[PDB]
Write a protein that binds this ligand. Structure first.
Ligand SMILES: Nc1ncnc2c1ncn2[C@@H]1O[C@H](COP(=O)(O)OP(=O)(O)O)[C@@H](O)[C@H]1O
Ligand SMILES: Nc1ncnc2c1ncn2[C@@H]1O[C@H](COP(=O)(O)OP(=O)(O)O)[C@@H](O)[C@H]1O
Ligand SMILES: [Zn+2]
Ligand SMILES: [Zn+2]
Ligand SMILES: [Zn+2]
Ligand SMILES: [Zn+2]
Ligand SMILES: [Zn+2]
Ligand SMILES: [Zn+2]
Ligand SMILES: [Zn+2]
Ligand SMILES: [Zn+2]
Ligand SMILES: [Zn+2]
Ligand SMILES: [Zn+2]
Lengths: 209, 209
C-alpha cells in the first residue's frame, strides 16, 4: 500500500518546533534518550522470550549498534529489541497526546534544562535537537516492516519498508543539522556513551564508515 | 531471495580499476553517457508501446529526472525507460565480456580521451569517474524490481528492492567522491546538460533537494 501522512498531535508539534528552534548548549542528551529507548525495547523482547522462546526466531542476538556516516551526515542507532508495529509507530511516535508534553514545553519556557526531556515521557523528540529529518525503520514480530519519517512541520509519514538488516528491532536514521555535525565524530560518540550510558545492560557497538 | 554477489568479468574489473585509479580531466562526460543510456531505455519502451500499448500500464510519462543532494553527496539519474530484469542487471552490468573493454583500456593508456568511452560500448562505467559507490534500482515489466550495487570491488551485488518511485524504469544513485562534489551544483549540472546532451528527445527534469 501507499505512504500515509499523519498529523502530529498539536502539543507534540509545538514541542518539536520549540526543540528545533531554541538554542540549547546541552544537546548530547539525544544519544542518552535514544539508547535508553533501545534498552527498553531490548528488555521487552528479553522478558518475552522467557515464556515464549520463539519470539527470538527473528534474531537471538540482543544489542544496540551506532553508525555515524560523515559522508552522508547521518547518525544511525539500531537495536534488535521488540520493534514497533504500524499501529505502534502511528500511536507512540506522534498522533496520541502525551500527558507530559505541555508540562515540558512550560518547564523549558521557564528555563529548565533540555536534559529533563525523558522524565516527561517525550525523550524520542530529542532526536530533533541534532537532526533536520529522522527516519525510523521498525519490524515487530506481530507485523510487517514499516518506516516512519518526519522533517517536523506538523506531520510525519508512515510507509511499508523492508530492510534486510532489521528482522526484528528498530533502526533510527538521523539526518544531522549542519551546525551539529560534531556529533558524527567517533571520539565524541565514545565519550557520550562512556559518560552517560555506562549502565545499559546490552552491548553498544560503534561502527565507523 | 536475498543479496547475491557477482564478480565483474575480468576486463571490466580492470577497466573499472584504471577508471578509478587514474586521474582524468573531462570527468563530466559521465552525465552524457548516463543520459544517453536513459534515452535508449526510453526509446525501447516507446517503440514497444507501438504494438503493445499495455506496456505503458506501468507509466505513460517518458522522461529523465536528475536529483542532486548536496547533503548526502549523492546524484540521482532516473528514467521511465524499459528498465532491466534481474537477468539484464546481472548480464548487462558486469558479468558478460564486452568486445570493446580491452581495446578501450589500451586506448586510454595510449592517451585517448576518456570521452571516447561510449564508442567502446562501455559508457556505464564512466559513473565510477565521479562516484565511489553506484546503486541502480531497476524495474522491467517482465520481472520484479531489483537493485544492483557496486563499490568497484571486482564484484557487485544484486538484491530484491522496491522503490515506489520506480514502477518501470531505472534509477541510478551515485555516491559522489569527495573531490567531485562540484558536480552536485545546479549551475554545473544544467550547463553540462545544455552543452553536451543537447539533442535528447525526452524531457530532462532537474530537481534540487
Ligand atoms: N527503539 C525503540 N523500539 C521500540 N519502541 C520504541 C523505540 N523508541 C521509542 N519507542 C516507542 O516510542 C515511545 C515514545 O518514546 P519516548 O518519547 O522516549 O518516551 P518514553 O520512552 O518515555 O515512553 C516509547 O514508549 C516506545 O513505545
Ligand atoms: N538506464 C538504463 N535502463 C535500462 N538499461 C540500461 C540503462 N543503463 C544501462 N543499461 C543496460 O546496460 C548496458 C550497458 O550500458 P553501456 O555500458 O553504457 O553500453 P551501451 O550503452 O554502449 O550499450 C546497456 O546496453 C543497457 O542494456
Ligand atoms: Zn524514552
Ligand atoms: Zn506474536
Ligand atoms: Zn499489518
Ligand atoms: Zn540526509
Ligand atoms: Zn564545533
Ligand atoms: Zn571531552
Ligand atoms: Zn557529557
Ligand atoms: Zn551507453
Ligand atoms: Zn553515500
Ligand atoms: Zn563542458
Amino acid at each position: 500500500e501507499n505512504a500515509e501522512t499523519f498529523a502530529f498531535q498539536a502539543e507534540i508539534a509545538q514541542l518539536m518546533s520549540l526543540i528545533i528552534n531554541t538554542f540549547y548548549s546541552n544537546k548530547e542528551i539525544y544519544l542518552r534518550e535514544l539508547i535508553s529507548n533501545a534498552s527498553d525495547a531490548l528488555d521487552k523482547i528479553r522478558y518475552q522470550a522467557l515464556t515464549e522462546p520463539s519470539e527470538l526466531d527473528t534474531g537471538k542476538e540482543l544489542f544496540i549498534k551506532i553508525t555515524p556516516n560523515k559522508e552522508e551526515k547521518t547518525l544511525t542507532i539500531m537495536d534488535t529489541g521488540i520493534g514497533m508495529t504500524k499501529a505502534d509507530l502511528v500511536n507512540n511516535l506522534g498522533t496520541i497526546a502525551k500527558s507530559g508534553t505541555k508540562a515540558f514545553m512550560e518547564a523549558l519556557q521557564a528555563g529548565a534544562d533540555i536534559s529533563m526531556i525523558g522524565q516527561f515521557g517525550v525523550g524520542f523528540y530529542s532526536a530533533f535537537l541534532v537532526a533536520d529529518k529522522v527516519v525510523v525503520t521498525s519490524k515487530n514480530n506481530d507485523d510487517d516492516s514499516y518506516q516512519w519519517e518526519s522533517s517536523a512541520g506538523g506531520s510525519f509519514v508512515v510507509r511499508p519498508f523492508n530492510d534486510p538488516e532489521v528482522t526484528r528491532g528498530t533502526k533510527i536514521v538521523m539526518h544531522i543539522k549542519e551546525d551539529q555535525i560534531d556529533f558524527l565524530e567517533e571520539r565524541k560518540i565514545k565519550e557520550i556513551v562512556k559518560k552517560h550510558s555506562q549502565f545499559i545492560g546490552y552491548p553498544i557497538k560503534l561502527v565507523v564508515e
